[PDB]
Design a protein around this ligand. Structure first.
Ligand SMILES: N=C(N)N1CCC[C@H]1C(=O)N1CCN(C(=O)N2CCC[C@H](C(=O)Nc3ccc(Cl)c(F)c3)C2)CC1
Ligand SMILES: *[C@@H]1O[C@H](CO)[C@@H](O)[C@H](O)[C@H]1NC(C)=O
Ligand SMILES: *[C@@H]1O[C@H](CO)[C@@H](O)[C@H](O)[C@H]1NC(C)=O
Ligand SMILES: *[C@@H]1O[C@H](CO)[C@@H](O)[C@H](O)[C@H]1NC(C)=O
Ligand SMILES: *[C@@H]1O[C@H](CO)[C@@H](O)[C@H](O)[C@H]1NC(C)=O
Ligand SMILES: *[C@@H]1O[C@H](CO)[C@@H](O)[C@H](O)[C@H]1NC(C)=O
Ligand SMILES: *[C@@H]1O[C@H](CO)[C@@H](O)[C@H](O)[C@H]1NC(C)=O
Ligand SMILES: *[C@@H]1O[C@H](CO)[C@@H](O)[C@H](O)[C@H]1NC(C)=O
Ligand SMILES: *[C@@H]1O[C@H](CO)[C@@H](O)[C@H](O)[C@H]1NC(C)=O
Ligand SMILES: *[C@@H]1O[C@H](CO)[C@@H](O)[C@H](O)[C@H]1NC(C)=O
Length: 338
């Protein structure tokens, strides 16, 4: 017997005590070691309601990662609310590691094992766990990186598809590598994507979106304004902030199918995701800066006043990292053992 409840979670990780990498350092002192003997109990004949869009676990992970960045990635200058802090900004070791979220005594985590689960509504195949799986806290916009994959079909996730203001999370079932490099202009970078791989996945995505939108025509367009962090695909590679133009990723025409090369820039002046504010970092480290990531999801925003047209147009979105955490926490919820 249990009931829906919120409580303060703790974290577990395989952090290395000797590592200078900042995620390891934070997990070493803020988490416990991962459960060496994790147990999963299947709940016979249990149906349970989930709502990934109203899930306190997401808020708690958000608070953790903000703390992680605040103790690890300090900018030369932080500009918040009129205040201006000038603190040490050395170059660091940066590579996210999986973090597990675990319940204290008197609580368990319920896990939805329905392979088609979209994040809201009833789940027929429910198990209970002490900890989630290991989630890498990858900060990014537009593209979800290094996550998990949907097990069966591509999944569309949204708090309310009919409401165009609600962010759409696309959960891929086959990852697509994105290989970004600043070769050894020191801020000029690029990302390489297999155009055959990507265009095929994207076609499947549009077909999935057809199913939710009455077989309408699915059109992609570049973001319609905003800050560079959201009009570009933003992410952190080895501590450097990359900003990549994704126009060639979301062009509906696909003489295509070669390597897709996105132009990128490393920016020193950042619009922080942790909260409204601007931060400045030192110029990039020397030599080849490279990151090979898996695209496992897409963040989309649908265009509004098309209620009576023939087209549904989608633009890459992001900005609220809670959606990133939500994309992995969607199948979990905390309950109190009554
Ligand atoms: N957290 C809470 N409680 N919130 C309540 C609703 C909005 C949200 C919120 O209050 N906020 C304020 C701060 N935010 C912001 O100002 N944004 C505008 C500028 C860009 C932002 C970006 O995505 N930055 C970024 C930086 C580096 C990387 Cl690598 C990256 F992938 C992304 C979006 C986040 C949402
Ligand atoms: C339910 O999910 C479990 C994972 O715990 C997996 O073995 C299988 O996909 C499902 N099994 C049943 C009996 O539904
Ligand atoms: C998710 O599944 C539930 C089934 O109960 C349904 O009500 C809802 O419309 C679905 N949402 C999406 C985006 O598929
Ligand atoms: C990328 O995807 C492949 C296959 O989908 C997987 O084996 C590999 O572990 C993934 N890499 C990362 C860093 O997630
Ligand atoms: C991914 O899902 C789509 C349906 O959305 C399906 O057609 C495709 O075969 C799936 N691919 C894999 C590798 O499971
Ligand atoms: C979803 O959004 C539409 C359009 O904004 C609105 O009419 C509808 O009431 C919403 N549905 C729910 C369940 O909130
Ligand atoms: C990534 O791209 C760089 C530069 O083009 C190349 O040297 C490297 O081999 C690529 N890595 C992979 C895994 O494709
Ligand atoms: C690009 O992806 C396709 C489909 O997965 C694959 O067959 C092809 O070998 C890839 N190209 C390269 C150069 O690896
Ligand atoms: C991305 O590239 C396209 C074409 O190269 C360009 O028209 C567009 O302005 C670029 N986007 C941004 C945000 O600079
Ligand atoms: C994704 O994971 C790979 C493998 O650990 C790593 O090399 C890469 O830098 C990661 N990408 C990001 C954006 O953290």
């Amino acid at each position: 017997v249990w009931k829906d409840a919120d409580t303060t979670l703790f974290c577990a990780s395989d952090a290395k005590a000797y590592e200078t990498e900042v995620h390891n350092v934070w997990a070493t002192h803020a988490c416990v070691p991962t459960d060496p003997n994790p147990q999963e109990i299947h709940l016979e004949n249990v149906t349970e309601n989930f709502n990934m869009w109203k899930n306190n676990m997401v808020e708690q992970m958000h608070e953790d990662i903000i703390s992680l960045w605040d103790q690890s990635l300090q900018p030369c200058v932080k500009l918040t609310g009129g205040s201006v802090i000038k603190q040490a900004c050395p170059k660091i070791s940066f590579d996210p590691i999986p973090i597990h979220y675990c319940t204290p005594a008197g609580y368990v985590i319920l896990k939805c094992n329905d392979k088609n689960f979209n994040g809201t509504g009833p789940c027929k195949n429910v198990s209970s766990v002490q900890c989630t799986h290991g989630i890498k806290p990858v900060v990014s916009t537009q593209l979800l990186l290094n996550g998990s994959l949907a097990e069966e079909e591509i999944i569309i996730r949204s708090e309310n598809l009919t409401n165009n203001a609600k962010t759409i999370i696309v959960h891929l079932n086959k990852s697509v590598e994105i290989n970004c490099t600043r070769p050894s202009d020191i801020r000029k970078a690029y990302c390489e994507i297999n155009g055959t791989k990507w265009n095929k996945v994207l076609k499947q995505v549009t077909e999935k979106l057809k199913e939710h939108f009455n077989n309408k025509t699915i059109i992609f367009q570049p973001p319609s304004g905003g800050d560079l962090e959201i009009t570009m695909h933003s992410f952190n590679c080895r501590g450097e902030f990359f900003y990549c133009n994704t126009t060639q990723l979301f062009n509906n025409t696909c003489g295509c199918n070669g390597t897709i090369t996105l132009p990128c820039k490393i920016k020193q002046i950042i619009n922080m995701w942790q909260g409204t504010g601007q931060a400045m970092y030192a110029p990039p480290i020397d030599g080849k800066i490279n990151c090979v990531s898996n695209i496992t999801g897409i963040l989309l925003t649908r265009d509004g006043g098309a209620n009576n047209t023939s087209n549904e147009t989608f633009r890459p979105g992001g900005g609220d990292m809670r959606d990133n955490w939500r994309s992995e926490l969607y199948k979990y919820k905390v309950v109190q053992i009554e």
